[PDB]
Structure 1
């Protein structure tokens, strides 16, 4: 998970809907060492299944309960930040400009 607000988010007890969209665009996913457009020729990608794993820390409940209670407050709340945050916009450049 590469999104900075979810990268290291510490999810507390509860039920959370979690969803995402996965690409099938051949050129966007695969790579080349020759630089040809794989979409022009074959080499498609199919998905047979998608699952999800998450490893829960087996922390003692006598501490997990206090931590959860103490993380619900206003002050003690997460706040995240990606390594490089910006507003990347491209500016077109005419040929030979």
Structure 2
């Protein structure tokens, strides 16, 4: 996981994050128009691991 985004103090990350909610991750969405607002955590301890 650490080598995927490289070494070095600074880095640029291009990641894909999935949907993990049970009622959504497998939902077959029918035609329409839906708002899909989500909030992403910015807490450094929770995002990163050492």
TM-score of the pair, normalised by structure 1: 0.32
1:28-43 pair list within 5 angstroms:
28-32=46-50
Question: Distance between the aligned counterparts of 1:19 and 1:9, measured in 2?
Answer: 16
1:56-67 pair list within 5 angstroms:
none
Question: Distance between the aligned counterparts of 2:48 and 2:40, measured in 1?
Answer: 13
The answer to whether the aligner puts 1:5 opposite 2:23 as a matched pair is yes
User: Aligned match of 2:43 in 25, 28, 39?
Assistant: 25
What displacement does 1:28 show? 0.5
More strand, by proportion: 2
What displacement does 1:11 show? 0.4
Aligned residues: 32
User: Aligned match of 1:15 in 33, 36, 47?
Assistant: 33
Which structure has the larger Rg?
1
**Where does structure 1 differ by over 3 angstroms across 4 or more consecutive aligned residues?**
none
TM-score of the pair, normalised by structure 2: 0.61
